Amino acid sequence: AQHITPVSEKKVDDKITLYKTTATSDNDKLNISQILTFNFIKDKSYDKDTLVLKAAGNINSGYKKPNPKDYNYSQFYWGGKYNVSVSSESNDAVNVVDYAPKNQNEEFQVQQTLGYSYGGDINISNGLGSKSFSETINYKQESYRTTIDRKTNHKSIGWGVEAHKIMNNGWGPYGRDSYDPTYGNELFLGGRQSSSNAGQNFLPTHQMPLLARGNFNPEFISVLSHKQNDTKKSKIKVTYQREMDRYTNQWNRLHWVGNNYKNQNTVTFTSTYEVDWQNHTVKLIGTDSKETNPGV
């Protein structure tokens, strides 16, 4: 599905005008949905247009329960990491100038307010002025951590939201790389000497983090500036991705061993928008969908 709302216009005050359009683009098979709020700001005091682009929607984990009949060995795939990126193409007059979250964050939920002030000053505050422009982000990431991609620059911003500190029946925390020389990576292992089938010897699904077995609901803001005298369109590409890890267990005739294999299936959805900075409108000119190992 895809949809773009008509532009709405709002006078923030005598100097600042807001033009807002919301674009939706999804992939039903992949269970990835992008809800993009394009907030274009024109400011009489400042010679650049500002786009405060909010990226929201859904990225399913891809988890499926293991087969409970699996006897001596079992496995499942889970949401090890979610990646979101926004990049500018096709116009050297456009630059990423700010974004939120700015810094690494391991809070169970991320809640921020981002504001526009005359002159293009961008500022940020925490949690969720009536005559100033602001936009908010709010997402849960329990047991996970947000990092900013170190390749981030003037043409691209990306974030990763990675499994970080996961408890397993009071044991842990564990993550994607935990290691014990006897039991392996015990992240989602049930019991070390369980008499259950392998498929029944994992942490119950309900006890896994929501991001591991459910979905992530991203909310990220990219702030882009555009030289107002430049008349060329530009392109913005928004990518949502999941890295699916394969968690396994194995019975060795004395005890179980767990293992986690990172990013064994990568699922990516990208939408490409053409941006008309003079009319403050966007068009979906492209999508691409990828799955490196489909069917898992």
Side-chain angles (χ1 to χ4, degrees):
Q2 67 179 87
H3 179 87
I4 304 167
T5 64
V7 182
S8 53
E9 183 183 330
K10 181 193 187 215
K11 304 309 216 60
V12 176
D13 56 31
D14 283 353
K15 286 176 177 153
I16 289 166
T17 307
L18 168 63
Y19 308 89
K20 182 176 175 165
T21 308
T22 302
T24 55
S25 182
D26 60 41
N27 182 313
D28 188 0
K29 176 76 166 52
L30 303 181
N31 297 132
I32 301 179
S33 170
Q34 302 175 328
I35 305 173
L36 305 183
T37 307
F38 291 78
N39 300 109
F40 295 87
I41 294 166
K42 182 170 65 175
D43 176 349
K44 294 196 193 279
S45 77
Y46 185 41
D47 67 0
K48 299 187 193 183
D49 296 308
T50 305
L51 171 58
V52 178
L53 173 59
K54 179 168 172 175
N58 180 67
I59 310 169
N60 191 69
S61 64
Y63 171 89
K64 298 180 201 170
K65 291 173 181 268
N67 183 343
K69 297 186 198 292
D70 293 349
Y71 191 67
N72 290 139
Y73 169 90
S74 193
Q75 62 178 41
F76 60 86
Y77 290 81
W78 66 280
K81 188 169 179 190
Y82 297 94
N83 301 125
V84 170
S85 66
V86 173
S87 63
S88 186
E89 305 189 340
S90 297
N91 195 331
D92 293 339
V94 185
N95 292 291
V96 179
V97 296
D98 216 330
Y99 48 89
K102 182 58 56 67
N103 303 131
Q104 183 175 301
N105 184 311
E106 67 184 274
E107 299 308 82
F108 277 23
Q109 61 169 23
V110 173
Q111 293 188 327
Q112 302 186 352
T113 300
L114 178 151
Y116 183 88
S117 293
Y118 311 124
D121 273 21
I122 303 300
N123 290 272
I124 306 188
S125 61
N126 287 338
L128 303 173
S130 63
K131 286 160 162 56
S132 285
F133 174 86
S134 71
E135 179 55 284
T136 62
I137 60 170
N138 179 20
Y139 65 86
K140 291 187 149 205
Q141 56 164 14
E142 298 148 332
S143 311
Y144 279 63
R145 182 176 74 166
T146 293
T147 54
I148 287 63
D149 297 353
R150 62 212 126 60
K151 271 35 265 152
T152 291
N153 59 32
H154 59 108
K155 299 299 186 191
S156 187
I157 170 62
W159 297 262
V161 181
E162 192 180 24
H164 176 50
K165 284 178 167 290
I166 298 172
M167 302 297 299
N168 176 344
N169 277 317
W171 293 72
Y174 296 110
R176 299 173 79 192
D177 289 289
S178 295
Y179 166 73
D180 182 281
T182 299
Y183 303 107
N185 183 337
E186 295 186 88
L187 175 60
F188 298 127
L189 184 63
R192 292 168 173 177
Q193 289 191 307
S194 180
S195 48
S196 297
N197 291 356
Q200 295 176 53
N201 196 33
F202 298 109
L203 184 67
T205 305
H206 75 101
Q207 290 289 112
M208 300 173 65
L210 185 53
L211 269 58
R213 39 76 167 196
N215 70 296
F216 179 43
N217 291 120
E219 288 202 3
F220 293 97
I221 290 168
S222 305
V223 187
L224 298 93
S225 70
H226 169 75
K227 282 293 210 166
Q228 203 156 55
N229 55 330
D230 164 90
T231 53
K232 301 191 161 57
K233 311 277 183 290
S234 73
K235 303 193 178 66
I236 293 177
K237 288 191 175 283
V238 179
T239 297
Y240 287 11
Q241 181 176 259
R242 55 169 175 275
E243 298 186 12
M244 292 167 68
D245 291 4
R246 184 168 54 97
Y247 189 77
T248 79
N249 60 8
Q250 174 68 63
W251 170 248
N252 73 15
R253 308 186 171 81
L254 179 58
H255 62 82
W256 294 89
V257 177
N259 281 286
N260 189 60
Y261 300 98
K262 293 163 72 186
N263 194 26
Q264 302 295 108
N265 187 27
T266 313
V267 179
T268 312
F269 183 61
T270 301
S271 298
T272 305
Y273 286 87
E274 178 196 88
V275 179
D276 181 334
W277 292 88
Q278 286 86 229
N279 296 118
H280 319 292
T281 52
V282 306
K283 301 175 185 175
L284 181 65
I285 58 166
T287 54
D288 56 275
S289 302
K290 296 182 175 83
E291 180 160 17
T292 56
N293 214 256
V296 306

